[PDB]
Write a protein that binds this ligand. Structure first.
Ligand code: PLP
Ligand code: PLP
Ligand code: 68B
Ligand code: 68B
Ligand code: CL
Ligand code: CL
Ligand code: CL
Ligand code: CL
Lengths: 354, 358
């Protein structure tokens, strides 16, 4: 069974928050409403769009003791004509259902959640900014909610969604093999709360070491997996002399990002250079930097879309990454095309109109 | 700058709950009171004892989004003298603090929290069952509580403690295990050695697989050489005559994928005090166990943990093939001896510095 949009009950807020005035730090400002659906031994209850409010949770909730939690993250963009659109939300929904199944949280209908989310965005339509490079960030969440200290499949869960309005520059990265984000056979390929908490300290260590984000290396040959909460891409002339865009394969330690998949799809479609999913090693990068074969290194994710990398501190070796002196041509093309699609400049099967 | 037990605020339930009748499934029944301490940028607030009540969380709470959550688990036992005691609670406090640092959560005084726990258990004295095999389980938690989607060191946090009466866990019955290398609990350089909630959520599906394959628990293998690391939520001990023909008790070393259990340390301490056989921390592979089994050198295999104290193992399903473990054939003398000494100590029959009186 599943909750249905047609059963939605609306409680409009009686106490609207002041909208942001002319400074937007990410993830602190929320809209007036939220979506709220509960699961229990009777199945999924009816979905509510209701005033943004606190959650009331039993102290034994499995969400708090055994990290029976997962999230999603996606943006809604408002175009010139004030039409609002979600970017490839179906893939976020596919990925939310996989997380849930990995955590034995209750299954749900992807299209019904989407419609509920759309309905929720429509209620908070005026929170969606329209200045350049601004968007509305959508945070669905599903948590187990059994009041039991037993490590087990819960018979109760909570699915809710909240929204935040959100308001080119290259970043530096610490690449230390000591630090591990995910392992083959682990759950790094799902968007689960537990994958993030442990990175806080590591991120602090990268700041202390004068870097801005973490380059997560994995395995004996130090594979480049991800950058911060982003997938990583390298544009270079490979060893076989062919020009390629490369990014690591989905072999268990990589989060299957929506932006990532989009960049692959675009480049693939262009048909101008080779586009592969393959392991990338610090050894390959060093050698390609020594031989001037690297053009652009960047990260991708809903946060920035495309984020260039100028520097990588590999232990004590400070590597200059020449992304910016090579345009950054590919990056700029990706941003340009993504902007066109996202803000309705160009009609595309990737946008879902609210 | 920690909270303080002198500042503790007491607020007694208006109407209490009727204690269970001597039917108790673990973790579904709680006592009348709980402890709560709030932290923010003005540091720790005053701790409080309050009637068991629900948490009020901002929906962006970092505890719920990025798994800023850690817990502990320790038992209190009521002796004949109706006096209740905590088993080595300082090791749990040490571990709770290390977990807190790992998750960038706020530091606190181990003795102050321990004193507040004393008071909480004191207040709920009567919930502590004295029937044989029973105890009060104590569950401290520390969760982040920043109301922002930024992945970061929170500026707010919540520390609470709830209590469960527990029935006799078992007589002692062995368990069968699923040993499948595809499922990996923790990795070197990871956080499997901290009691973080994020280590437990992904084990549900695996545990469910073990049941469909006819096992009761998971034997967590690690490496290409299939090391026996842990059993369910228990550390693993093997009693055998080793390759060199020397009788020993072995348990994997704390190389980072092992949770340093309090019973584990205690079994080690106890066994070395007896000084009657070799006690060592060494890696254990399925290759070594197989051969030991074919040669009749394995006497007992068991788990250790607060839940069980000591849990016999009698079967391992490895590579579709069932491995019989003669634990029960061999007494289990070691297990039985361990169980007895802990019991005597835990219920104050023998006086011991491991016990902290409530
Ligand atoms: C969210 C996330 C990504 C990329 O996600 P998108 O769907 O592209 O926004 C990549 N890696 C990690 C670790 C993430 O949490
Ligand atoms: C809690 C726990 C143990 C044992 O801990 P005790 O301190 O002995 O109760 C062992 N392994 C795992 C994975 C645990 O969570
Ligand atoms: O996208 C994220 N953060 C973000 C969004 N918009 C601007 N800056 C940062 C994110 C990703 C993964 C986990 C948590 C947050
Ligand atoms: O001690 C635990 N569970 C338990 C306790 N008493 C009886 N049965 C089971 C435990 C340990 C670690 C993580 C979660 C729970
Ligand atoms: Cl349990
Ligand atoms: Cl995947
Ligand atoms: Cl962030
Ligand atoms: Cl350790």
């Amino acid at each position: 069974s599943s909750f249905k949009a047609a059963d939605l009950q609306l409680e409009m807020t009686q106490k609207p928050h002041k909208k942001p005035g002319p400074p937007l730090v990410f993830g602190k400002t929320f809209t007036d409403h939220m979506l709220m659906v509960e699961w229990n031994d009777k199945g999924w209850g009816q979905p509510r769009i209701q005033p943004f409010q606190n959650l009331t949770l039993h102290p034994a909730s499995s969400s708090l003791h055994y990290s029976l939690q997962l999230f999603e993250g996606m943006k809604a963009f408002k175009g010139k004509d004030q039409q609002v659109r979600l970017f490839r939300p179906w893939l976020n929904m596919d990925r939310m259902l996989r997380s849930a199944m990995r955590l034995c949280l209750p299954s749900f209908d992807k299209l019904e959640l989407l419609e509920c989310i759309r309905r929720l965005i429509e209620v908070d339509k005026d929170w969606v900014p329209d200045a350049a490079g601004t968007s509305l960030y959508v945070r669905p969440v599903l948590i187990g909610n059994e009041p039991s200290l037993g490590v087990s499949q819960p018979t109760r869960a909570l699915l809710f969604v909240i929204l935040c309005p959100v308001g080119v520059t290259p970043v530096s990265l610490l690449a230390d093999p000591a630090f591990i984000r995910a392992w083959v056979g682990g759950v790094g390929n799902y968007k689960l709360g537990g994958n993030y908490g442990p990175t806080v300290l590591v991120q602090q260590e990268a700041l202390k070491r004068g870097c801005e984000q973490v380059l997560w290396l994995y395995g004996p040959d130090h594979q480049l997996t991800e950058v911060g909460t982003m997938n990583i891409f390298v544009y270079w002339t490979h060893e076989d002399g062919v020009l390629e865009l490369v990014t690591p394969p989905l072999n268990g330690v990589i989060l299957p990002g929506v932006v990532r998949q989009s960049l692959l799809d675009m480049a693939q479609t262009w048909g101008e250079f080779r586009v592969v999913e393959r392991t990338i090693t610090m050894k390959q990068l060093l050698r390609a930097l020594e031989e001037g074969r690297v053009r652009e290194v960047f990260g991708s994710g809903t946060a920035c879309q495309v984020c260039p990398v100028h520097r990588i501190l590999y232990k004590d070796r400070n590597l200059h990454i020449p992304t910016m002196e090579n345009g950054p041509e590919l990056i700029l093309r990706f941003q340009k095309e993504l902007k066109e699609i996202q803000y309705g400049i160009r009609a595309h099967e990737w946008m879902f109109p609210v």
